[PDB]
Amino acid sequence: VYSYTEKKRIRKDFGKRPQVLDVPYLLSIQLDSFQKFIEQDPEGQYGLEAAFRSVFPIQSYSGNSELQYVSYRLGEPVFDVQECQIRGVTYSAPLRVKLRLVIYEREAPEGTVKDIKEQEVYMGEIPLMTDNGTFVINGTERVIVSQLHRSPGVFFDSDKGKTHSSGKVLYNARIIPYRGSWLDFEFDPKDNLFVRIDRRRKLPATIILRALNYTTEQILDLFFEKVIFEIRDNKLQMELVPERLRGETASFDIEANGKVYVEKGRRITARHIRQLEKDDVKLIEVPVEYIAGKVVAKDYIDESTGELICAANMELSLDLLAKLSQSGHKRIETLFTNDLDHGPYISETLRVDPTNDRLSALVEIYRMMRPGEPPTREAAESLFENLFFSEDRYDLSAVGRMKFNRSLLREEIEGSGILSKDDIIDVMKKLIDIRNGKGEVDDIDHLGNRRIRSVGEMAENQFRVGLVRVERAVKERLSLGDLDTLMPQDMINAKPISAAVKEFFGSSQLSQFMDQNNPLSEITHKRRISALGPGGLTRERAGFEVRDVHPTHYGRVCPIETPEGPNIGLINSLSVYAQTNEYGFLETPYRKVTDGVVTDEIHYLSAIEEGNYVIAQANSNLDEEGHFVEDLVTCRSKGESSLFSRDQVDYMDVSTQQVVSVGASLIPFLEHDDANRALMGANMQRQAVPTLRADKPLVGTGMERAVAVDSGVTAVAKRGGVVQYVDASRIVIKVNEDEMYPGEAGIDIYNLTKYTRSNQNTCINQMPCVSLGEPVERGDVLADGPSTDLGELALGQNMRVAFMPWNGYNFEDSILVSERVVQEDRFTTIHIQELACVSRDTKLGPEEITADIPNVGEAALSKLDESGIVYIGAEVTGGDILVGKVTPKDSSLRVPNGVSGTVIDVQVFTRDGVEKDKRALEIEEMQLKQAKKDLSEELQILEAGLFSRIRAVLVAGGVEAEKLDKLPRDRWLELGLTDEEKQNQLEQLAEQYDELKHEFEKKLEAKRRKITQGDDLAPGVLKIVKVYLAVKRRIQPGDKMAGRHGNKGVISKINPIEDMPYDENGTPVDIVLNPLGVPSRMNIGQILETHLGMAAKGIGDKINAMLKQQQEVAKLREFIQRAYDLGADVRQKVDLSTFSDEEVMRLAENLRKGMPIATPVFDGAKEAEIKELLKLGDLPTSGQIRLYDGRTGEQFERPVTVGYMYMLKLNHLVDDKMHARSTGSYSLVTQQPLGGKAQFGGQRFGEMEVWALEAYGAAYTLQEMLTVKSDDVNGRTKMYKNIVDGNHQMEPGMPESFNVLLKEIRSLGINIELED
Amino acid sequence: EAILREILRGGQVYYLYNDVENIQKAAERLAELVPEARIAIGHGQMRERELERVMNDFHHQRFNVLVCTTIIETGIDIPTANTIIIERADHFGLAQLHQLRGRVGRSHHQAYAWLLTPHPKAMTTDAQKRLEAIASLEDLGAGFALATHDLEIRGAGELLGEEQSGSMETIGFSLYMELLENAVDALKAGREPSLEDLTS
Amino acid sequence: IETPITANFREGLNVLQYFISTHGARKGLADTALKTANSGYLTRRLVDVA
Amino acid sequence: VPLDGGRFATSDLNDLYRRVINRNNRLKRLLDLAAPDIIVRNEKRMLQEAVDALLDNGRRGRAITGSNKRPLKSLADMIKGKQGRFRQNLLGKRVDYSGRSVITVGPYLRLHQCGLPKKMALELFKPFIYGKLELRGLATTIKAAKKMVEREEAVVWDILDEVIREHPVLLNRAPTLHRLGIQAFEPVLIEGKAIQLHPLVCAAYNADFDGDQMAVHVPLTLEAQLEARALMMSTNNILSPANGEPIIVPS
Amino acid sequence: GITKASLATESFISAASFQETTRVLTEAAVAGKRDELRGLKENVIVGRLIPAGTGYAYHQDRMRRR
Amino acid sequence: AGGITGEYLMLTYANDAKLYVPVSSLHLISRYAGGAEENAPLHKLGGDAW
RNA sequence: CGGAGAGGUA
Ligand SMILES: [Mg+2]
């Protein structure tokens, strides 16, 4: 029931909702998408197989040989990921594919084979995602974020009324195919439906109508309703449907069957239509003006002379009807036109259309498509037939057809990848309906319209782009003759594939450097949802419509966690339970609500299907059956929330924390914060620095273990068993006898990563948490990585805080930090920097790194060896020498000015062929010794495991306690044992030990070769040396530290212990925050966390009291049981009677520093539970205590809040930020000082700061800040001399960057000069 | 339509396939496309007697269309041949394209010179530049302009060496004149015989 | 929205009311960012006319 | 300029001038040859196009391209816009004797003085220290004084307390919106790394203490120090210019 | 408006260091204009004293000298 | 071979570059004439053309 | 002290 890592320290879980679906693997998007990329696909629709079947088989141009594809297989990486990070080479795998080349013999007719060759050709190096989600491209670990772009399909958008200023909205429709030419219909303010293709010239839409072989008659039949007139004995009798008169005004006496139904001047009432239906009317006598404006449907030819009376789509009139009736025409068909319901948007376009048939329509489409090129028949018909109806030059994807048929109210979400006739007709009908108001436009930022294009899809796209170039090269090379001598690999070059996959993985707008100063920062950078990138919107041209959180974001995208600043909401982050659909849309889990019972079946609803049903709220109280306790529950119907009946609901939310991300699910009491402060809390919790010793949060949200385990920072056991040898650098696990495999049993080894350097220059180092001789299970955390404590996220330290103003040292947002905080060595963080020195190949000979340099004392060469490289472990300070280098005529790598630290790792690279120096050689000798020690220690530990299993199976069938030790372990086969299956098992294990012996003799030489192999470097250099400094940046006034609820602030004083406000017991407060930051920034969650942390440390202090004095295990057991009780019907329910009286003494050993508390995000601990838990300890249940002053020794009246707030130290130090400059380098084209801190640069006194001096009277100060201090070199040298000579006086002169301007205008045809 | 334009006029067609292995196929492919033609092949790897056999058949109009490689670059020009069709104008020297474009005519019959190219994405960028270079400057006296545009496309090769038409960064014109006058002085000075002359 | 968030910050906020509060805050933040971008050019235009 | 790898930077103006010179030399030779009119006409056309590309590229639609599918930076492209000479290198420019650091509170200060770290104060006022060390006779050159300041003996802190004494520095925040965004302040030397800022002026600076950084400029001449003390000192800006009401309100 | 009233200034530097530099340079180079350095911006460009504060007395002296 | 079925002879030359020839063209195949059916060498297909 | 791209602080 409890894993052994979770029996060490059981986090007391508050919260009352029983969870029905565990959190998924938090990196499911990256891992599952890329395993959708590289996997053998028998169905052949995903990844590399789909690309190969899409391109191959390829025909030669002469049509005599095709090159076809059989199967593919990923090879093995020549380097491991640690070595890839060390050497600076891509972690890639070879792509070995079996192409098959046929040859057709010229004698026999088309289709015959002479010879058919088939070999495995090497093409490309595709990088492999590591077992976390991160690629290694050049040793810089890059993460590829998913993209949120428009799904190909049909979009009915509109202007809101923002063109041509008449207030008319212009409803437009647009077909966006996945691959092909776009189409879009739009309106003109003259109510004309026009067509255009790929934003070319704008044609009448009836041209595209005719081009599909539609006559005018078919157009009017499809796009309009008919009205039947009949000339008879009196008047033009006309057949009428009752509903046709809705919303018109009566213009005559509407009379039928001798009954005057409607009088003129009346709006046709609902009663009119009802009485017309009741009286069973069909026919109306209409006057002659009721045809005088209406328009005929069909062209009417003479029944005798065969001549056309009225053209198609022509308005009837008086004499027109007379000539129609004198030709014996009895039936008249008319367009059911309106002004509000069925407008004449097609007829007017037919009138403005200058084209009368299909062929001239195709010619018009040609002349719009291609200027020039006088069209023919076959050219135009071919262009139109392959413009939208070719499977190869136009293709909606399967997602494209899905969106197309879904948005057009169809049912078949499968179909052809091309357009058709009825598709375009349905689009046109939908656009006309939207103009009529029936049907509505589609908002673009709806998550049913936006699609997740993850790493698998983008890499497959770039690989297909790489393949199509190889396709052309193979095509032309096969077109080249003499094909019998050649082979696959000769025509097909690997370079296009590798180049076009490397320009994606290396330098793309979405393959970005990994934020790697946390476990949380990694695991929430691998789930970002960028709206930018190729095929997406631009960063600085995104309106407020995109940046708002749409009501579809619930459950799919976190609404709070997003960066603030220039891109708010463009870089959204995924929610906890959200997944990607089979088409790419974001779907979220829900519980299916049956007749009245909330069941436990989980339906993943997408963003479109959600709008039809109604979904309950995450916390709507049901009691033990799935029946809601309330008969009016809060629900979400369609992009909007309401109050619904207890039987009307369809779905419940899965868990109370499905709205938020993983970065904002670790904020306790999130339901009490604001959303601005929750945004700031998530965005700064993403920045915390892993401190020296990790310290658990006393108030978590129970999500800490998921974040620690799911990210790859911890070292977690693959198979359970018993630990056999724990070092600070490795962990050996002897497997249990049941999970272990039959052949090559062995025991598992976890080589922990020691003090290596993260991407953000922080220290990541796994350290073991399991002691020797200790059982572990499958999924048990063995080693805690950077900022983890016993396998749960511990980003910062939990600190005793008091909320009061203290002499203004915490004035605005500042923090007053006790000196006990820096004494206890808790916020001091390691920072590892990497300095590289290069040995260029240059004129007058390359550079030698040997120690001999001129104009140096021996103190500058005290630490460097004979070879010119500083020893490992030598404390350097700013200005020292790490690697001495010479100018061929002091080009040494010096420590930058200001940084201390210890040199902890020196690595040397060298091109193959260049001889190495003595310290270089000893580095490879230690590397050979280390690799041989690793392989040989692996070999002998595996020998011990194999022989331990050999002795374990020897218990039955040939047991020999003393005979087995008469000969050594090697000859453990030919002893006394009956020739049965057990001897076969002994043969298996011993012959596989022999296999391990062979593995030694090859693997050792392979590693020896790898160590002595020269490494590829960029041309120009010879040898590269990298020195790794380790600094311990502790804390000082200035280091910006924050909390979890968005309460940032630099610290303003390191106050000594006795000055700190101490309580009635004598314990000094460690941090004095400010109360004034709580009301105006409504983050009440920090006060609630302060109280809960006070309660937790009270419980931990009581356990520490019962442990410091020795008390029997019954007392501790009873108190811990009381503590794990007292929730208001919580779901934790841990029972201590199953604990074996030893693990209680370890549980209460881990609980002596405060009893950790879980507060799930929106189902947290109420106030009553906090008061009760404070009451269990001997603390005052009001949260606040009386707190004595430190200096005056008297009492702070108005008793103040103390507690245990969990504070982080962010990565905005003050050693990084402080900078100053008197005189240094100067820029070249313009003699202004350089800019930056890396460059020794001066601050920019910009435009606004110049206005800030013009607004004063400071003319002289301004004059020197833009002539003397900066720009006039003849002025600044003399100013330096004057300052040194004690005389403060400027001779200003003329700024040089105005002479630069003068020359750059004078170098045009403009004479600009200075007068007298 | 180009082939029937030249045939029903009464003149031969220079079909330029520029390949030896596939030209045999292209013969019957063109024959199937154009039944109204009398097609035969001639290329440089024929036995050099059948080649002149085909040429002396071609002077006497016994067959219209001659699918042929660039042996006609030398040209044996007849009066009736008046339409050259390049099958792959993608890869050809610009000088070669102009020269073959000059192989037709020599009569009062208005000639044509089609330059069939592959898909505009398929051809290389230098192939593109050659194609607008030949398409644009089309008039009388375009021989010099085409070579002038060929320069700065390929770049003048190294001045003092072999290997015309290369974009190399070798010695400039200023240094070359200096070397030449220095050589003139050192030669005219002391009695120094010529290099190649002492090769005698 | 016709249903106001009926709970203060001392009591909790359930999921839906927090979603609506999140919308309001995101609108405020985006408006602040692009508003600063708009105001800088305005004060530049006034400075270089007076 | 070189990119350290045996090559040189592009410097697009050189490419445009090279095109113009090439075309002009071609035209000169063609005029010396009495060439036919069509070829010299084409060469004069392409010369005119080269001149239009050099003077103002991008006024024509076909912007000339050197690499990266990127239009070249012409002569007129070095003047217009945010990155031209006028707005980037002339109106506002980078300055010597300047520094930048995170700010904290320090509420013991008086209204006219601000904290200043010892390292920053030694680094801005380095020429003043050199002058005083040559005056005291402790280093009879600039090199020995430079070594002394680089070593930080216990005499240079006395020299600082002699040269800080009544020498205002200008504190500045990043979005300097109004004229109370640059204010003079007498320095007090601090054994820290943050610029302590008297908390009455955080209303004028709009400066919360949650990670803001401020820049320290140093007025050199006597006119500038007197301008700072008489116009820009914090004890003179207690009434805002936008309204008569105070701006040093207890916050 | 402040845009057009800033561009239609009598001093072409005060209208060229504002937006739309190239049109100001052409229109003020054809007409052969002259800039007398009156505003507080062109003196910033050419790096002499501001004629507002402590530099106002200096500019008064320079105006009375000629 | 493009929509037709066929039966062929698998020949594994050096480096396992497979070659097939149809059973119809069996007359392109001979037994090894060196008498070294347990000592025969293994050519590569077509040779090093490029 | 070239350019492009990606982030981040106020
Ligand atoms: Mg701030």
Side-chain angles (χ1 to χ4, degrees), chain A residues 1215 1219 1221 1226 1232 1240 1242-1245 1256 1260-1261 1266 1269 1307, chain D residues 17 88-89 92-93 95-98 100 123 179 193 218 227 237:
Chain A
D1215 304 303
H1219 159 74
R1221 186 180 194 271
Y1226 286 96
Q1232 283 168 3
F1240 186 73
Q1243 303 317 300
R1244 183 163 148 89
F1245 195 72
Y1256 284 127
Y1260 280 120
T1261 297
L1266 61 83
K1269 288 214 264 213
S1307 162
Chain D
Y17 273 119
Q88 186 94 347
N89 294 27
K93 62 180 73 175
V95 186
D96 286 345
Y97 297 99
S98 88
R100 174 173 210 90
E123 182 58 340
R179 58 165 259 198
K193 264 184 152 201
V218 164
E227 269 171 11
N237 289 173

Short mmCIF file of all heavy atoms in Angstrom, two decimals, chain A residues 1215 1219 1221 1226 1232 1240 1242-1245 1256 1260-1261 1266 1269 1307, chain D residues 17 88-89 92-93 95-98 100 123 179 193 218 227 237:
data_model
loop_
_atom_site.label_atom_id
_atom_site.label_comp_id
_atom_site.label_asym_id
_atom_site.label_seq_id
_atom_site.Cartn_x
_atom_site.Cartn_y
_atom_site.Cartn_z
N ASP A 1215 25.97 39.20 -7.79
CA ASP A 1215 27.29 39.03 -8.39
C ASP A 1215 27.21 39.11 -9.90
O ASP A 1215 28.14 39.60 -10.55
CB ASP A 1215 27.90 37.70 -7.96
CG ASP A 1215 27.96 37.55 -6.46
OD1 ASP A 1215 28.58 38.40 -5.80
OD2 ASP A 1215 27.40 36.56 -5.93
N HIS A 1219 28.02 46.10 -11.98
CA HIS A 1219 29.04 46.40 -12.98
C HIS A 1219 29.34 47.89 -12.92
O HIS A 1219 28.47 48.69 -12.55
CB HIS A 1219 28.55 45.98 -14.37
CG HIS A 1219 29.25 46.67 -15.49
ND1 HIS A 1219 30.53 46.36 -15.87
CD2 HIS A 1219 28.83 47.63 -16.34
CE1 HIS A 1219 30.88 47.11 -16.89
NE2 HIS A 1219 29.86 47.90 -17.20
N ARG A 1221 32.34 51.10 -14.65
CA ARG A 1221 33.34 51.40 -15.66
C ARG A 1221 33.81 52.84 -15.54
O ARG A 1221 32.99 53.75 -15.47
CB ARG A 1221 32.77 51.18 -17.05
CG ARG A 1221 33.76 51.31 -18.16
CD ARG A 1221 33.02 51.07 -19.43
NE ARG A 1221 33.86 50.84 -20.59
CZ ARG A 1221 34.31 51.81 -21.37
NH1 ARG A 1221 34.00 53.05 -21.10
NH2 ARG A 1221 35.05 51.53 -22.43
N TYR A 1226 36.73 51.01 -26.66
CA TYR A 1226 35.84 51.90 -27.37
C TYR A 1226 35.46 51.26 -28.70
O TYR A 1226 36.26 50.52 -29.27
CB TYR A 1226 36.49 53.26 -27.60
CG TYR A 1226 36.56 54.10 -26.36
CD1 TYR A 1226 37.70 54.13 -25.58
CD2 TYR A 1226 35.48 54.85 -25.95
CE1 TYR A 1226 37.77 54.90 -24.44
CE2 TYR A 1226 35.53 55.62 -24.82
CZ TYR A 1226 36.68 55.64 -24.07
OH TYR A 1226 36.73 56.40 -22.93
N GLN A 1232 32.29 55.57 -29.47
CA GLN A 1232 31.49 55.43 -28.28
C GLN A 1232 31.97 54.22 -27.49
O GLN A 1232 32.54 53.29 -28.07
CB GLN A 1232 30.01 55.26 -28.62
CG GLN A 1232 29.32 56.53 -29.02
CD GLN A 1232 27.97 56.29 -29.62
OE1 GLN A 1232 27.51 55.15 -29.68
NE2 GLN A 1232 27.32 57.35 -30.07
N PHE A 1240 33.61 45.08 -21.63
CA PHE A 1240 33.73 45.93 -20.44
C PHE A 1240 33.12 47.28 -20.79
O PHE A 1240 33.80 48.27 -21.07
CB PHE A 1240 35.18 46.04 -20.00
CG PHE A 1240 35.36 46.78 -18.73
CD1 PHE A 1240 35.00 46.19 -17.54
CD2 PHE A 1240 35.92 48.03 -18.71
CE1 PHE A 1240 35.16 46.85 -16.36
CE2 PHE A 1240 36.10 48.69 -17.54
CZ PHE A 1240 35.71 48.10 -16.36
N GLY A 1242 29.98 50.47 -20.92
CA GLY A 1242 29.37 51.52 -20.13
C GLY A 1242 27.89 51.60 -20.42
O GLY A 1242 27.43 51.21 -21.49
N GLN A 1243 27.13 52.09 -19.44
CA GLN A 1243 25.69 52.17 -19.56
C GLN A 1243 25.30 53.16 -20.65
O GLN A 1243 26.03 54.11 -20.95
CB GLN A 1243 25.06 52.58 -18.24
CG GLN A 1243 25.42 51.66 -17.10
CD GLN A 1243 25.37 50.21 -17.49
OE1 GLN A 1243 24.32 49.71 -17.91
NE2 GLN A 1243 26.49 49.52 -17.37
N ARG A 1244 24.15 52.93 -21.25
CA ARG A 1244 23.65 53.76 -22.33
C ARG A 1244 22.81 54.87 -21.74
O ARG A 1244 21.85 54.60 -21.01
CB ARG A 1244 22.85 52.94 -23.33
CG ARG A 1244 22.40 53.76 -24.51
CD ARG A 1244 21.97 52.89 -25.66
NE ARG A 1244 20.90 53.54 -26.41
CZ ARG A 1244 21.11 54.37 -27.43
NH1 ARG A 1244 22.35 54.62 -27.82
NH2 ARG A 1244 20.09 54.93 -28.04
N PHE A 1245 23.17 56.11 -22.03
CA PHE A 1245 22.39 57.26 -21.61
C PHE A 1245 21.53 57.60 -22.81
O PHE A 1245 21.99 58.23 -23.77
CB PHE A 1245 23.32 58.40 -21.23
CG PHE A 1245 22.66 59.49 -20.48
CD1 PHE A 1245 22.28 59.28 -19.18
CD2 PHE A 1245 22.46 60.72 -21.05
CE1 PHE A 1245 21.68 60.27 -18.46
CE2 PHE A 1245 21.86 61.71 -20.33
CZ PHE A 1245 21.47 61.48 -19.03
N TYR A 1256 15.61 69.44 -16.94
CA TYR A 1256 16.33 70.21 -15.94
C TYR A 1256 17.04 71.36 -16.64
O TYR A 1256 16.81 71.64 -17.82
CB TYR A 1256 17.35 69.35 -15.21
CG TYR A 1256 16.79 68.42 -14.18
CD1 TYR A 1256 17.09 67.07 -14.22
CD2 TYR A 1256 15.99 68.88 -13.16
CE1 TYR A 1256 16.60 66.21 -13.29
CE2 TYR A 1256 15.49 68.02 -12.22
CZ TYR A 1256 15.81 66.69 -12.29
OH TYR A 1256 15.32 65.81 -11.36
N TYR A 1260 25.57 71.58 -18.98
CA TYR A 1260 26.96 71.14 -18.97
C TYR A 1260 27.07 69.64 -18.75
O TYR A 1260 27.89 68.97 -19.40
CB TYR A 1260 27.73 71.88 -17.88
CG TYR A 1260 28.16 73.26 -18.29
CD1 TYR A 1260 27.73 74.38 -17.60
CD2 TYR A 1260 28.97 73.45 -19.39
CE1 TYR A 1260 28.11 75.64 -17.97
CE2 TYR A 1260 29.36 74.71 -19.77
CZ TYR A 1260 28.92 75.80 -19.06
OH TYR A 1260 29.30 77.06 -19.44
N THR A 1261 26.26 69.10 -17.84
CA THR A 1261 26.26 67.66 -17.59
C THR A 1261 25.86 66.90 -18.84
O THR A 1261 26.49 65.89 -19.20
CB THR A 1261 25.32 67.34 -16.44
OG1 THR A 1261 25.80 67.97 -15.25
CG2 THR A 1261 25.25 65.87 -16.20
N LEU A 1266 27.39 63.62 -23.66
CA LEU A 1266 27.30 63.27 -25.07
C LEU A 1266 28.46 63.80 -25.91
O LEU A 1266 28.45 63.60 -27.13
CB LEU A 1266 25.95 63.71 -25.65
CG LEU A 1266 25.48 65.17 -25.69
CD1 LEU A 1266 26.01 65.93 -26.88
CD2 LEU A 1266 23.98 65.20 -25.66
N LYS A 1269 32.53 62.44 -22.02
CA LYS A 1269 32.60 61.13 -21.40
C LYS A 1269 32.52 60.01 -22.42
O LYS A 1269 32.98 58.90 -22.16
CB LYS A 1269 31.47 60.96 -20.39
CG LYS A 1269 31.62 61.75 -19.12
CD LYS A 1269 31.05 60.98 -17.96
CE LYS A 1269 29.64 61.41 -17.70
NZ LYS A 1269 29.27 61.35 -16.28
N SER A 1307 28.39 61.51 -48.20
CA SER A 1307 28.70 60.46 -49.15
C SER A 1307 27.53 60.11 -50.04
O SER A 1307 27.65 59.20 -50.87
CB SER A 1307 29.16 59.21 -48.43
OG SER A 1307 29.07 58.09 -49.31
N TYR D 17 29.73 49.17 -52.99
CA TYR D 17 30.74 49.95 -53.70
C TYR D 17 31.49 49.10 -54.71
O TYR D 17 31.84 49.58 -55.79
CB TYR D 17 31.70 50.58 -52.69
CG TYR D 17 31.25 51.91 -52.15
CD1 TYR D 17 31.01 52.08 -50.80
CD2 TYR D 17 31.06 52.99 -52.99
CE1 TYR D 17 30.60 53.29 -50.30
CE2 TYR D 17 30.65 54.20 -52.51
CZ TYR D 17 30.42 54.35 -51.16
OH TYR D 17 30.01 55.56 -50.68
N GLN D 88 20.12 56.18 -32.59
CA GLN D 88 20.88 55.18 -31.85
C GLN D 88 22.25 55.65 -31.41
O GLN D 88 22.70 55.27 -30.33
CB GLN D 88 21.02 53.91 -32.70
CG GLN D 88 21.66 52.73 -32.00
CD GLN D 88 20.64 51.81 -31.38
OE1 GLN D 88 19.46 52.16 -31.28
NE2 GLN D 88 21.07 50.63 -30.98
N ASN D 89 22.95 56.44 -32.22
CA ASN D 89 24.31 56.83 -31.88
C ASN D 89 24.48 58.31 -31.59
O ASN D 89 25.56 58.71 -31.16
CB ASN D 89 25.28 56.45 -33.00
CG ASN D 89 25.40 54.95 -33.18
OD1 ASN D 89 24.48 54.20 -32.87
ND2 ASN D 89 26.54 54.51 -33.69
N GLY D 92 21.09 59.40 -28.15
CA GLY D 92 21.40 58.67 -26.94
C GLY D 92 22.58 57.76 -27.14
O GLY D 92 22.63 57.01 -28.12
N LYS D 93 23.55 57.79 -26.23
CA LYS D 93 24.81 57.11 -26.48
C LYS D 93 25.40 56.56 -25.20
O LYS D 93 25.03 56.96 -24.09
CB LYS D 93 25.77 58.06 -27.19
CG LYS D 93 26.13 59.29 -26.42
CD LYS D 93 27.08 60.14 -27.24
CE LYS D 93 26.36 60.81 -28.39
NZ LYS D 93 27.25 61.74 -29.13
N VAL D 95 28.10 55.69 -22.27
CA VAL D 95 28.84 56.67 -21.48
C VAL D 95 29.88 55.97 -20.61
O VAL D 95 29.63 54.88 -20.10
CB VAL D 95 27.88 57.52 -20.62
CG1 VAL D 95 28.60 58.63 -19.93
CG2 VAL D 95 26.83 58.13 -21.46
N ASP D 96 31.04 56.60 -20.45
CA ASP D 96 32.04 56.17 -19.47
C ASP D 96 31.55 56.50 -18.07
O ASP D 96 30.48 57.09 -17.88
CB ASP D 96 33.37 56.86 -19.73
CG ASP D 96 34.09 56.31 -20.92
OD1 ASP D 96 33.70 55.23 -21.38
OD2 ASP D 96 35.03 56.96 -21.40
N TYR D 97 32.37 56.16 -17.07
CA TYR D 97 32.16 56.53 -15.67
C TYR D 97 30.77 56.17 -15.18
O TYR D 97 30.09 56.95 -14.51
CB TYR D 97 32.45 58.01 -15.46
CG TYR D 97 33.88 58.39 -15.75
CD1 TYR D 97 34.22 58.96 -16.96
CD2 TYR D 97 34.87 58.19 -14.81
CE1 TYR D 97 35.52 59.30 -17.23
CE2 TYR D 97 36.17 58.53 -15.08
CZ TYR D 97 36.49 59.09 -16.29
OH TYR D 97 37.79 59.43 -16.57
N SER D 98 30.32 54.98 -15.56
CA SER D 98 28.94 54.58 -15.31
C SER D 98 28.90 53.16 -14.79
O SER D 98 29.80 52.36 -15.05
CB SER D 98 28.09 54.67 -16.57
OG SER D 98 28.18 53.45 -17.28
N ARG D 100 25.95 50.00 -12.85
CA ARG D 100 24.60 49.47 -12.80
C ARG D 100 24.55 48.36 -11.77
O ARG D 100 25.41 47.49 -11.77
CB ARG D 100 24.19 48.95 -14.17
CG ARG D 100 22.86 48.25 -14.20
CD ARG D 100 22.47 47.92 -15.61
NE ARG D 100 21.03 47.92 -15.77
CZ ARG D 100 20.32 48.98 -16.11
NH1 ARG D 100 20.93 50.13 -16.34
NH2 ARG D 100 19.01 48.90 -16.23
N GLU D 123 35.58 51.88 -8.71
CA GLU D 123 35.75 51.72 -10.14
C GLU D 123 35.34 52.96 -10.94
O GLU D 123 35.97 53.27 -11.95
CB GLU D 123 34.97 50.50 -10.63
CG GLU D 123 35.08 50.17 -12.12
CD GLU D 123 36.49 49.90 -12.67
OE1 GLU D 123 37.52 50.29 -12.10
OE2 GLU D 123 36.57 49.27 -13.73
N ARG D 179 11.21 63.84 -15.50
CA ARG D 179 12.49 64.43 -15.11
C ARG D 179 12.88 64.13 -13.68
O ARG D 179 13.99 64.49 -13.28
CB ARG D 179 12.45 65.93 -15.31
CG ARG D 179 11.36 66.63 -14.55
CD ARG D 179 11.62 68.12 -14.50
NE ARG D 179 12.17 68.54 -13.22
CZ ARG D 179 12.15 69.79 -12.78
NH1 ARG D 179 11.63 70.75 -13.53
NH2 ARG D 179 12.67 70.09 -11.60
N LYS D 193 26.80 45.07 -2.29
CA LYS D 193 26.84 45.08 -3.75
C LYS D 193 25.57 45.65 -4.35
O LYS D 193 25.29 45.42 -5.53
CB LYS D 193 27.08 43.67 -4.28
CG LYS D 193 28.53 43.37 -4.58
CD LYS D 193 28.70 42.00 -5.19
CE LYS D 193 29.92 41.96 -6.09
NZ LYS D 193 29.85 40.84 -7.05
N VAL D 218 28.54 59.51 -13.21
CA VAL D 218 29.41 60.36 -12.40
C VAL D 218 29.66 61.67 -13.13
O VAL D 218 30.26 61.66 -14.21
CB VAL D 218 30.72 59.63 -12.07
CG1 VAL D 218 31.76 60.61 -11.58
CG2 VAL D 218 30.47 58.59 -11.02
N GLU D 227 25.86 71.68 -11.12
CA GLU D 227 24.55 71.45 -11.70
C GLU D 227 23.81 70.35 -10.97
O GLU D 227 22.62 70.48 -10.70
CB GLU D 227 24.68 71.11 -13.18
CG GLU D 227 24.60 72.31 -14.07
CD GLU D 227 24.94 71.98 -15.50
OE1 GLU D 227 25.02 70.78 -15.83
OE2 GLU D 227 25.12 72.92 -16.30
N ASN D 237 14.03 68.33 -5.66
CA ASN D 237 12.89 67.78 -6.38
C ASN D 237 11.89 67.17 -5.40
O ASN D 237 11.70 65.95 -5.34
CB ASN D 237 13.36 66.75 -7.39
CG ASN D 237 14.09 67.36 -8.55
OD1 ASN D 237 14.64 66.66 -9.39
ND2 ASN D 237 14.08 68.69 -8.62
#
